[PDB]
Amino acid sequence: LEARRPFPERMGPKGNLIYKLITTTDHKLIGIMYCVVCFAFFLVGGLMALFMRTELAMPGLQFLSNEQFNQLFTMHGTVMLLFYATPIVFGFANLVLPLQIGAPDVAFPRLNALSFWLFLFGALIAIAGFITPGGAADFGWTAYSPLTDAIHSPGAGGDLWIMGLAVGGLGTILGGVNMITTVVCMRAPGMTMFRMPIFTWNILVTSILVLIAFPILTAALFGLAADRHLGAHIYDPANGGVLLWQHLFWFFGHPEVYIIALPFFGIVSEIFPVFSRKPIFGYTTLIYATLAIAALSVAVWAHHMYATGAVLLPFFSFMTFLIAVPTGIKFFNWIGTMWKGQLTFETPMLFSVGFLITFLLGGLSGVLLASPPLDFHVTDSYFVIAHFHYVLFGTIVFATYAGIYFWFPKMTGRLLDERLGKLHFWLTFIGFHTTFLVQHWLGDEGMPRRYADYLPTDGFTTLNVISTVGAFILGVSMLPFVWNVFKSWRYGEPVTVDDPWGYGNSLEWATSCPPPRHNFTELPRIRSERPAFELHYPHMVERMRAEAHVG
Amino acid sequence: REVLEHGVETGIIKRLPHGAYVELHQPLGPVDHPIPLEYAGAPLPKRMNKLG
Amino acid sequence: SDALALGWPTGITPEAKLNRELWIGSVIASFAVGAIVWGLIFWTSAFHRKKATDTELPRQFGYNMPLELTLTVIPFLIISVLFYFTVVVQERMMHKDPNPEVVIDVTAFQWNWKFGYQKIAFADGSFDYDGADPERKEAMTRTYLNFDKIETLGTSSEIPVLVLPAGKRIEFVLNSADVIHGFWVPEFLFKRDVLPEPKANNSDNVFQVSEIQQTGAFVGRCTEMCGTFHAMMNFEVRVVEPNDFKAYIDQRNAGKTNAEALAAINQPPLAITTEPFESRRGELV
Amino acid sequence: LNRPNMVSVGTIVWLSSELMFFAGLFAMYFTARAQAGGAWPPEPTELNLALAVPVTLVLIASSFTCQMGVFAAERGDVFGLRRWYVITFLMGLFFVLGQGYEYIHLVEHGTTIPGSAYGSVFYLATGFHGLHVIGGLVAFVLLLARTKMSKFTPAQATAAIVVSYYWHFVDIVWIALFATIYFVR
Amino acid sequence: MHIEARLFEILTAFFALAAVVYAVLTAMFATGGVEWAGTTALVLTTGLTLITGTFFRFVARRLDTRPEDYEDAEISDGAGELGFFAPHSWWPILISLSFSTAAVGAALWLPWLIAAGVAFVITSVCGLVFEYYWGPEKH
Amino acid sequence: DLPYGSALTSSGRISAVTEPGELSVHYPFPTMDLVVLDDALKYGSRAAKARFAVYIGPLGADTAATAREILANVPTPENAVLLAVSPDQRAIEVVYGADVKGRGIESAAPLGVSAAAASFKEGNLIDGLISAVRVMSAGVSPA
Amino acid sequence: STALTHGLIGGVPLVLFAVLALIFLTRKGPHPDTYKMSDPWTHAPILWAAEEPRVVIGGGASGKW
Ligand code: HEA
Ligand code: HEA
Ligand SMILES: [Ca+2]
Ligand SMILES: [Cu+2]
Ligand SMILES: [Cu+2]
Ligand SMILES: [Cu+2]
């Protein structure tokens, strides 16, 4: 027998966190800081989305002007893409990647905190445009060239948008540098490159894509700021200015969407084998598919520029189909992982299945968008809106929640209540499909995107009502998760074991909950890509060797 | 209090043969692990370059 | 058809018909793939669940290289057939016969349109009109912009109505005075970005419909973010008969506004598929 | 020495990202060169190819001296490293002064950022490269101070190595930009 | 470390092939000749991957196998000292605040605020870089 | 011997796992009751500068000997006050160390026994423990 | 319309939340049912310590209920 306490500590004493928040080089605390701040920014973006949907419920302009609605979708898109998704990627990276490779830290612990604070302050700078009397940016998140000049949209909110994006991009580049260096030269003795999990590979390729993409956006933003302040002629339509901005921006922006897609593919590829009681299927195949996606996400940038009539349609359309193939391979590998196993739908596995369904439908919609003749009708319409919301809830919402539910015990030492988790998942699923299934139809029969107001004779009222109802279901779905996290942090069920999910595979389940400072008091003999499984179940090693090949 | 009770964190990490990542602490007093000193209202060093 | 096209309006040009058929086929393929993969997901979730009897971990298999390559190559075939049909259709929708029958100088300015009737040349040889106005074009050298004698300026109170014949080849030359706009007529199943200087930016601002099949009234919208009133920039295309079209052109020749000529040609004077927007910034005004 | 140095690899990957930033600037320059119509550079621009060659040669010489200072710092000689890096700092300062002088002479001759598209792209690209050069000079000063304030450990040698890496990236980018602007035209 | 290098020149090979294909397919069969923005970006993406891969290959040509690059490795092989990791610092937040001051001064075009932000950046970067190298006070 | 999913590690630590959806701690009491007991123990032992401990389980026969045995495996047995409760044998015991002498526990250990009994009559184990620990803590002053 | 659709947006989320909470909250959790003094103490021996202040026995007391 041994002594304990009846319950663990609810909260630390006074002055236990604030100086850590200011001065920590700990990657786990910094990952938690990303998680919390990214979720707050997600709430702000969703509030903007609810305002837009409430306005779009009825054909009249009830409470929003056109200026305000343009501000709202510009800032909603900007916040959701750049202040929630891109930084939550590095939040998850900081949370688990040093644990996954058996490292005591990231390569540059101070550069990590610098990246986080650059995130926070750039996001704040870009959002502070509402404080201006002219309002925040009201030209969309894509910032197309002539509309963004000193003449058209001349306010200060757009300039704050540009510079906040510059600061956040610098932070993202620094974080990517840190992740690449940490992966390259900080692994444990046994951990070979082909023994890191899928998540580590995905963060590595994501960091490569970040290094490729974000400097382009920074240079484009600096040219735009030159044209706005110094009256430069970089993007002037007399030159090839408008197409110059389109090319530069999309060379950034499609790598951006794959940057926010790949790490969550890694998250689900981590979660699936645990709750499947099986190994991840096609480990090497998944590594190569991830590499193929990373390589191909750089030459397809002009499938967003079909309607301009100034690009090579066959080249980009073919490259888009070619990049569509590997994601199909990835779904096949995930299905093979779930196939013929023992599935228990604790909340992360349920969220991963939701990811599968939602992102599959989004990918089908994207393939439809890939054909230039079909994009000639459905571009700039709510069909694009529905497609990219489907892929974005696939990656950065269902898989974000799956990862949060999965790695909450590892980071806090407490469980999240599974009943509130199931309620939250079903609310999210129903609300999301309610609010985004009908927009395919709404865009097919022409309702363009970014319209603040339409006509009663347009014939769009019923589907917009359904969309607004679903949007408010999505709004009320955040209460179960917020309440669950808030109560479970302090009064959550204690975890006194390693791997409270039973069949964890990677090294983060070989240490305690939470891991101590430097993450490891001992390291196991690493011999495959699931070291914790072999450690915790040593009778299964010969099984796994003998039965690894299906044929 | 943390500095007084564990000693200054030197920023140096060692991997022990069994896999333990430990940080090298420099005690400000004698060791038995250091004997925890008593706070005396004075500033404490927290970087090793400041101790020479 | 009606439900399987997921809402695309029935085409009114041969290019629109072909595009709609390609969309129907592509939606069939996409929904078939989705049905297959979702059936796999539901078969795995419903069955293959950890039972009360299940005592030992399952077969720890993770590599099935043959099936991996089979399902690697199947999507390549699907995207190959899609690419072939795509290139065929997108080349058909950009044919550009060197002799148009009606030419329109579409000009988009800050939240309205302006049509030109640059050069009408009927194929039967019954009507030839040369509306190009080069003195106005040279008066401001925006050389890229095009002017014409007969115009239809959209206003805050009047929706600009384009009048065209049926069965006659129509060419649109797109120009924008200020910023990028969008020329979309949801019935053509086709839209194009209206750029400031389409030539200096290497863009093809010209596109043709071989023939508008049936006459009527059709709404058009701006489909490119352009600023405050982006949602309040609609226009209308009123396809009429060739003889009615010639009569309308002749009335417009003798100093007649659009509404007056439309009334003269036994048609509604104003837009009927869209209405002008209330200038009031909201209902709380 | 049986492991790689991570400060070096981090510097290398970040330098590659900075190369991508200058890729964006190069894409800005190449466009509007094809829109001018062959009159490139247009009047009243007349590139002073008599001061641009000397500053290019001084930058190459500074790269050579910086590598020599790396050689000095690899054997633990802090004083030789200090000497070579002070020489490199002075010659990079001379390069910046020459760039500013050419800027002044060009602006005096009706070539400005708002004046023309060629001016816009030329001053944008060259000024951003000059900002990177000034950042390198600040890095040199900070490194020399740090070598002054502690015993010359291998960590100091690593810092000097990565500062030289940045300097080499800078002057290679300048070689490319000079070849693109004053030769291809 | 052969794997990391090899991944980087695989990316380099694909990027070079794509860049050359784009340049050729835009020189002929495009509206206005070579596109000059996708081509430039693709060529310099090739350059980015080339630099990283070349440096890693020069490192792998000059390295005996590490524990982590060696299969059948035992934890005891990796035993010893790793290096210096900063235990704590409040300089990153100051650097970020300085860069944010500069960014606000250049968003709202205020040259004085730009200069103040730049000076603050130099000061906070000096503080970060000098943090573990300042000696004991002389007195 | 190690449970299923448990393994010995190179540093002596026992790395164990729990079933998905299963709990590592499964005390047969409400969570908030455990929180209240933790607060009672920690704040009472903070005020009295003596470690209060609660033991629940079998005492067999000769309960005094069993409780005095259990006391010695508290982290600081000398400054420790352990209250043992055996519901199968319905026995309440208080045992305290040598350094807890003449501080105030002499008259307060029977007080804690009486409080725990007057709460156990109704049939509340945790609540009786709370009352006993509160009373015993309030009955002891620091060294 | 304004009477109705506002009611839809206000109330459909609320009724969906209500029904899903009835389904998913009132369910049995994994926390074990609280012990009853009537039943035998089958749980393993429990030793809790306050662990706030960071062998020989010199006192004691006894009693019963
Ligand atoms: C999560 C981020 C993310 C991801 C991963 C994707 C992935 C894809 N996207 Fe897109 N996309 C966006 C985010 C993303 N996208 C955003 C934000 C916009 C709008 C930006 C704006 O304008 O504001 C956009 C817009 C956009 C456009 C431009 C439309 C326009 O601007 O008007 C196109 C064109 O091709 C496109 C297509 C695709 C395709 C083919 C994929 C492929 O990667 C999908 C791959 C998936 C599958 C292919 C399904 C799974 C495969 C199988 C089951 C095998 C069998 C399947 C077949 C044989 C088809 N999406
Ligand atoms: C990460 C990707 C992402 C996410 C998560 C979202 C989130 C949502 N989005 Fe959005 N969206 C985009 C990507 C995304 N979006 C992009 C790229 C654009 C383009 C913008 C542009 O063109 O510039 C866009 C814009 C956009 C449009 C196009 C509008 C138009 O063009 O006319 C629509 C259409 O319905 C929409 C709807 C929604 C809804 C209902 C949610 C819901 O998921 C939101 C759910 C969250 C909530 C509802 C929060 C609930 C609020 C509270 C609980 C109150 C508490 C808040 C505080 C205390 C501050 N958003
Ligand atoms: Ca409305
Ligand atoms: Cu895309
Ligand atoms: Cu578009
Ligand atoms: Cu418009």
Numbering used by the authors:
A (entry chain F): 11 to 561
B (entry chain B): 438 to 469, 473 to 492
C (entry chain E): 28 to 168, 193 to 336
D (entry chain G): 19 to 203
E (entry chain H): 1 to 139
F (entry chain J): 15 to 157
G (entry chain I): 2 to 55, 69 to 79
Reproduce text from the manuscript describing this model:
Cytochrome bc is an intermediate complex in the electron transport chain and functions as a terminal electron acceptor, converting oxygen to water and contributing to the proton motive force, required for ATP generation for bacterial survival. It forms a ‘dimer of dimers’, containing two copies of subcomplex III (bc1) and two copies of subcomplex IV (aa3). Subcomplex III consists of the three subunits: QcrA, QcrB, and QcrC, while subcomplex IV consists of six subunits: CtaC, CtaD, CtaE, CtaF, CtaI, and CtaF, complemented by PRSAF1. The QcrA and QcrB subunits of cytochrome bc make up the Qp menaquinone active site and share high sequence homology between M. smegmatis and M. tuberculosis (QcrA: 78% identity, QcrB: 82% identity).
Therefore, we engineered a version of M. smegmatis cytochrome bc in which all five residues were mutated to the residues found in M. tuberculosis, which we termed cytochrome bcMtb-like. To establish how JNJ-2901 interacts with cytochrome bc, we determined the cryo-EM structure of M. smegmatis cytochrome bcMtb-like bound to JNJ-2901 to a resolution of 3.1 Å. Overall, the structure is identical to previous structures of mycobacterial cytochrome bc39. JNJ-2901 is bound in the Qp menaquinol binding site, located in the QcrB subunit of the subcomplex III. This is the same binding site as for the other cytochrome bc inhibitors Q203 and TB4724,25. The density for JNJ-2901 is well defined allowing for an accurate positioning of the inhibitor. Only the end of the tail of the inhibitor shows weaker density as it is located out of the ligand binding pocket and has no interaction with the protein. The interactions with the inhibitor are mainly hydrophobic in nature with only two hydrogen bonds between the protein and inhibitor. Almost all contacts are with the QcrB subunit, with a single contact from the QcrA subunit. The five residues that we mutated to make the M. smegmatis ligand binding site identical to M. tuberculosis all interact with JNJ-2901 (marked with a star in Fig. 3d).
